[PDB]
Amino acid sequence: KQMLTRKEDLLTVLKQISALKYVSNLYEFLLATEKIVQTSELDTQFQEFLTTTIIASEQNLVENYKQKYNQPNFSQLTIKQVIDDSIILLGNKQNYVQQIGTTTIGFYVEYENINLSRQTLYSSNFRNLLNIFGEEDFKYFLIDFLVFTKVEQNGYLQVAGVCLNQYFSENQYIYPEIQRSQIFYCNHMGREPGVFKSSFFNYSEPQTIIKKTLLKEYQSKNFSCQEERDLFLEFTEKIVQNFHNINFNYLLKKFCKLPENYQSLKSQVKQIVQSENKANQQSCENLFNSLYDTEISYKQITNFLRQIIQNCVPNQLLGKKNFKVFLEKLYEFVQMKRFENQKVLDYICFMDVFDVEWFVDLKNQKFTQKRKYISDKRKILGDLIVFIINKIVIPVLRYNFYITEKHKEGSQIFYYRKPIWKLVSKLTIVKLEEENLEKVEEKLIPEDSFQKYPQGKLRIIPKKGSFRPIMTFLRKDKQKNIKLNLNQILMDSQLVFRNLKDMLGQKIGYSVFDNKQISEKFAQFIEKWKNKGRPQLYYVTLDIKKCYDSIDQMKLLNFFNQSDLIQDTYFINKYLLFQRNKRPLLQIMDNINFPYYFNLKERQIAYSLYDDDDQILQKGFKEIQSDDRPFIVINQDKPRCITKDIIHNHLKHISQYNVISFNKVKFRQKRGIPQGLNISGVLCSFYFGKLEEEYTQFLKNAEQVNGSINLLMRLTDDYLFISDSQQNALNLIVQLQNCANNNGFMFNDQKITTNFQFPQEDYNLEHFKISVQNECQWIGKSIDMNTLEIKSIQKQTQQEINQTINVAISIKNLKSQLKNKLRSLFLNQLIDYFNPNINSFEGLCRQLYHHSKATVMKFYPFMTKLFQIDLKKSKQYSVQYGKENTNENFLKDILYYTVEDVCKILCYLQFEDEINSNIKEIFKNLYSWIMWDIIVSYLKKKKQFKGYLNKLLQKIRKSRFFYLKEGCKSLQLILSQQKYQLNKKELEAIEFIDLNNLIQDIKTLIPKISAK
């Protein structure tokens, strides 16, 4: 079967595209056109360039460019003149590589932008190419072909032809959208409960005022006649009249009332605010917890909303049954998650058009065209639903509640009464003022920065016993001519610091940024441990508390000024990158295009004017590849320049004059840099790397002074250290404590996790709380101290799992959405730690087992939501899956194809291309059986799947088991032929398979892989 390969050729990939009919390298094209002959001699560099250059065309034009004996080939014009002639011949066409950064004016061409690819076009290789070709043929070759030149080991740069991005590109009604997002984060409070004074409910105090304030709905195009509009206006008048008779205080007191000790909490808050001395930490934590335990329940809020709706909206506006359906769906909407939303169709598909009685049709289409009448009335029913919701429900929730999410509860939603949130805000302000925030006056801040930079907003998330402030910088000042926010202003410096991050990795400290770096460091340490001979290992884990706020602005500025890794001037280049996806190559239904095999990404890069080794000036890109598969890059014509002085000014401004607002009250930071800026992580990493390299001198020489293996990484403020010497670990702890004492920062909770036990009295570590565990846990990862294997940490309950899942389903692209979602869920974390250099076969099997067990529970809500819609009413799916078991067939197809793709990717990641195809197939079958067994075991108890689907899944699992057994049996005969010589990895795989006795059954490996 088709397998993914780590090594691929651009020509081979291009020959698999149906649109392109002629694909060949330049040398063979020239030989076919007889412009050159084999007996002719050329320079070795020119020959290599001709061989490596790849051209392609939509049609076969070899005859058109055949050598003509009418006139020889001699060149007298310049290469620029030939290029200008070709560009002029191109005319009005505006999608070609050669036109980038230039414009045509009559028979004159003008260059006005920087294009880094022009060097290849005007190179001596292209000069000799033109000399061989001739002007008249070159001008048309630059248009009729797509030219790709190799500039790296696997990279190619397109220099001519139609831009590749061009290949990556009667109306129907679209219903409005429920504005659910407006409910969150409303800090406003009013003397009388109800809605905002700006609403039409309060603005009215006749039909004239209501019409004026509700024109947007009154003059809608869905209304058939003026009588319908008048009836709707009368209904709105009745709604407005009914609204003013609602006792909001009584409703609140009945359904969602304040706790009994609310007065006590208010008195405590007032006393804490008025107290001059610092408040008691445990008392404040208890007050925080007591305030946070006053949340309202979903059922309570649903009853509140239902009671509000019933006595305010006439029952005949929607119909007797439709009103009840809407009320029932209101609860589902209420309990709906943060980044999730409902749709109008969710109500329309379940109510009946004919229930409405006041609907009138100008033409008697009720009996002639029932479907047309139904559509016409649906267009009005949806409008009514959207109006009711977005005009009553959302404003009430916004005005009378603060709605947000907690710290460690994921995406789950919580509600709090407004006075409780006012008390929480006062207490949080009191807490922040003493530590890091100060009330500020606009007189102090200079007007230059005042008009040059926008300010930020502050948001508070509840936490167990405390809070968690978050400051945002999305806003932009309409006045003072500001059109960008802080991130848009600073993304240039962000690019510069991202460039800095590359040499920040290994030069001046121990900093890591991605799982690839973590994995390669782990692999190197594992190899060194293997060389040493598997001795005992000890680990220590600690982290910094509030790293961002503990940053010295003067020290950071001094480091920035004296750091030579940042050059004076930089240039910004933009380019497009085309990269191979994770899809195997089809072997030759007819519509095959570039997006089927390549992914388009937009990239920016900053480069210095030095004669650097990477010579970015020659190429225009800097990309890292983990495989030999090719990729294509095309440049752009939008360059930018950034100077170190501008970065210095930005850093000084953000360090000194950082201004944020809260409840229309301005604040200013006193220490550290604000979290949430795009440069904060890199700046923090650099700042702490300086101190850690200052205080970790001994580690630089320890590995050869006494030959001790030791590994230290720091991700942002989190530290992990594994070594062989308890003395080395203790020395590191002591040095880190000394550095913290000297630089005025501290570690979180005074807690440290170790693998050993030592007397803390000797090293003045009495205040520390040492926790001893035999299994290390770092950044959510689980590491063994015995086999030195790594696997991720997964939750254990469906309630925990569901809190972090947002479900969004659209009928238009069900197949694509579900396939991509399942693919992402499986490949989220497993691909980054499936390195065979780290785990053994058993370790990989266990990792896959646990990850699949987590992912199935993760994805279960998706099919639960899917079953709420019957696909038999949709032709697009019924024609493909019948009408009896459409849902079951659709789910089976999705699961089967997703599992097959995941297994193929897993085999590609695990094995190299040199391994035997039989071994690859056997391992793929084993993985498929594991996944299907997990899925079947999970789903065998569910009631919705209890019938038709389970038999199909059991059949699939049985087929996979049979195929695995058959492959294992045939592999013995295959190897017995002596036709193949096995390497060490193949021998290891054979030994593993024979030890686990995969020939007969799987019962041997299950205890080893399912152990927890």
Partner 1 sequence: QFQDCMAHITELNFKRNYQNLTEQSSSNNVVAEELDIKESLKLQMEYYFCDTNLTHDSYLRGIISKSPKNCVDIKVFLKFNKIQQILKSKKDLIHLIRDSLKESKILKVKMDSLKVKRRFPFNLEQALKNSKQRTLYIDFLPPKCSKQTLVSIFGNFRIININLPLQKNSQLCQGFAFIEFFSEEEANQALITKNSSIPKELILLTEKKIGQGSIRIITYKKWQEEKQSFKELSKNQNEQKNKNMNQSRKASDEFVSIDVEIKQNCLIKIINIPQGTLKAEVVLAVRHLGYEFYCDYIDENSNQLNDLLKEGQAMIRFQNSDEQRLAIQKLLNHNNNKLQIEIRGQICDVISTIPEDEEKNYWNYIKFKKNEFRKFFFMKKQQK
Residue numbers at the binding site for partner 1 (CB under 8 A): 364, 367-368
Residues within window 828-847 making contact with DNA, judged by CB under 7 A: 828-829
Residues within window 199-258 making contact with RNA, judged by CB under 7 A: 247-250, 252-254, 257-258
* Residues 96-126 as b or e (16 or more Cβ within 10 Å = b): bbbbbbbebeeeebeeeebbbbbebbeeebb
Pick between residue 245 and residue 277 the one whose CB is nearest to RNA: 245
Query: Out of 339, 350, 358, 948, which residue is the one contacting DNA (CB under 7 A)?
Result: 339
Contact 724, 713 (CB under 8 A): no
Residue located via tokens 């066409």: 93
The binder of 806, among partner 1, RNA, DNA, none, by C-beta within 5 to 8 A per type, is DNA
Please give the order of strands across the beta sheet that includes 769-772. 710-715, 718-723, 538-543, 751-754, 769-772
Residues within window 667-706 making contact with DNA, judged by CB under 7 A: 681
Number of residues that bind RNA (CB under 7 A): 148
- Residue 405 within binding range of DNA, rule CB under 7 A: no
Smallest distance, RNA to C-beta of residue 701, A? 31
- Residue 689 within binding range of RNA, rule CB under 7 A: no
Of 420, 377, 188, 396, the C-alpha closest to 309 is 396
Contact 707, 724 (CB under 8 A): no
955 CB-near residues (< 8 Å, 6+ apart) = none
Smallest distance, RNA to C-beta of residue 734, A? 31
Contact 109, 103 (CB under 8 A): yes
88 CB-near residues (< 8 Å, 6+ apart) = 104, 107, 109
Residues within window 302-321 making contact with RNA, judged by CB under 7 A: 307, 310
- Residue 814 within binding range of DNA, rule CB under 7 A: no
543 is in an annotated binding site: yes
Residue located via tokens 């087992």: 849
Hey, what's the torsion of the CAs at 526, 531, 533, 539, to 10 degrees? -30
In angstroms, the CA 682 to CA 201 distance is: 50
In angstroms, the CA 857 to CA 1002 distance is: 24
The binder of 793, among DNA, partner 1, RNA, none, by C-beta within 5 to 8 A per type, is DNA
In angstroms, the CA 298 to CA 145 distance is: 64
Of 329, 361, 356, the C-alpha closest to 345 is 329
Contact 970, 918 (CB under 8 A): yes
Site string for DNA, 771-790 (x = CB under 7 A): --------xx----------
In angstroms, the CA 287 to CA 265 distance is: 7
Q: Which amino acid is at 622?
A: K
Residues within window 869-888 making contact with RNA, judged by CB under 7 A: 869-870, 873-876, 879-880
Smallest distance, DNA to C-beta of residue 410, A? 7
Query: Out of 39, 824, 976, 978, which residue is the one contacting DNA (CB under 7 A)?
Result: 824
Q: Is 612 helix (H, G, I), strand (E, B) or coil?
A: coil
Residues within window 64-83 making contact with RNA, judged by CB under 7 A: none
Site string for DNA, 739-778 (x = CB under 7 A): ----------------------------------------
Site string for DNA, 299-338 (x = CB under 7 A): ----------------------------------------
* Residues 316-349 as b or e (16 or more Cβ within 10 Å = b): ebbbeebbebbeebbbebbeebbeeeebbeebbe
Query: Out of 290, 819, 974, 1006, which residue is the one contacting RNA (CB under 7 A)?
Result: 819
DSSP for 465-482? TEEEEEEE-----TTTT-
The binder of 364, among RNA, DNA, partner 1, none, by C-beta within 5 to 8 A per type, is partner 1
Pick between residue 368 and residue 701 the one whose CB is nearest to partner 1: 368
Using CB under 7 A, which of the segments 339-347, 636-644, 689-697, 837-845 binds RNA? 339-347
In the chain, the N- to C-terminal Cα span, in Å, equals 35
Smallest distance, RNA to C-beta of residue 430, A? 13
Query: Out of 48, 832, 842, 988, which residue is the one contacting RNA (CB under 7 A)?
Result: 832
Query: Out of 643, 738, 804, 917, which residue is the one contacting DNA (CB under 7 A)?
Result: 804
Displacement of CA 836 from its chain's centroid (Å) = 26
Q: Which amino acid is at 78?
A: T
CA angle (924, 926, 931) in 5-degree steps: 95
Smallest distance, partner 1 to C-beta of residue 170, A? 25
Pick between residue 93 and residue 873 the one whose CB is nearest to RNA: 873
The binder of 372, among partner 1, RNA, DNA, none, by C-beta within 5 to 8 A per type, is RNA
Pairing state between β 54-57 and 102-105: unpaired
Contact 153, 8 (CB under 8 A): no
Contact 492, 640 (CB under 8 A): yes
The binder of 484, among DNA, partner 1, RNA, none, by C-beta within 5 to 8 A per type, is DNA
645 is in an annotated binding site: no
Please give the order of strands across the beta sheet that includes 781-783. 776-778, 781-783, 790-792
Smallest distance, DNA to C-beta of residue 828, A? 5
Using CB under 7 A, which of the segments 530-538, 704-712, 740-748, 963-971 binds RNA? 963-971
Query: Out of 103, 263, 558, 649, which residue is the one contacting RNA (CB under 7 A)?
Result: 263
Pick between residue 592 and residue 746 the one whose CB is nearest to RNA: 592
Residues within window 850-879 making contact with DNA, judged by CB under 7 A: 858
- Residue 378 within binding range of RNA, rule CB under 7 A: yes
Pick between residue 288 and residue 548 the one whose CB is nearest to RNA: 548
- Residue 411 within binding range of DNA, rule CB under 7 A: yes
Smallest distance, DNA to C-beta of residue 454, A? 13
| Tokens, residue 65 | 């460019």
In angstroms, the CA 215 to CA 994 distance is: 78
The binder of 851, among DNA, partner 1, RNA, none, by C-beta within 5 to 8 A per type, is none
CA atoms within 13 A on the CB side of 829: 15
Query: Out of 716, 737, 755, 835, which residue is the one contacting DNA (CB under 7 A)?
Result: 716
Residues within window 426-455 making contact with RNA, judged by CB under 7 A: 454-455
Pick between residue 126 and residue 453 the one whose CB is nearest to RNA: 453
Of 261, 252, 213, 258, the C-alpha closest to 236 is 213
Smallest distance, RNA to C-beta of residue 89, A? 27
Site string for RNA, 169-188 (x = CB under 7 A): x--xxxx-----xx-xxx-x
Query: Out of 693, 718, 893, 988, which residue is the one contacting DNA (CB under 7 A)?
Result: 718
Using CB under 7 A, which of the segments 28-36, 123-131, 294-302, 801-809 binds DNA? 801-809
- Residue 681 within binding range of RNA, rule CB under 7 A: yes
* Residues 138-151 as b or e (16 or more Cβ within 10 Å = b): bbbbbbbbbbbbbb
Of 387, 391, 341, the C-alpha closest to 222 is 387
Smallest distance, RNA to C-beta of residue 472, A? 4
Pick between residue 483 and residue 943 the one whose CB is nearest to partner 1: 943
- Residue 95 within binding range of DNA, rule CB under 7 A: no
Contact 537, 525 (CB under 8 A): no
Pick between residue 129 and residue 712 the one whose CB is nearest to DNA: 712
Residues that bind DNA (CB under 7 A): 339, 411, 484, 488, 681, 715-718, 779-780, 792-793, 804-806, 808, 817, 821, 824-825, 828-829, 858
Annotated binding site: 543, 717-718
Annotated binding site for Mg(2+): 543, 717-718
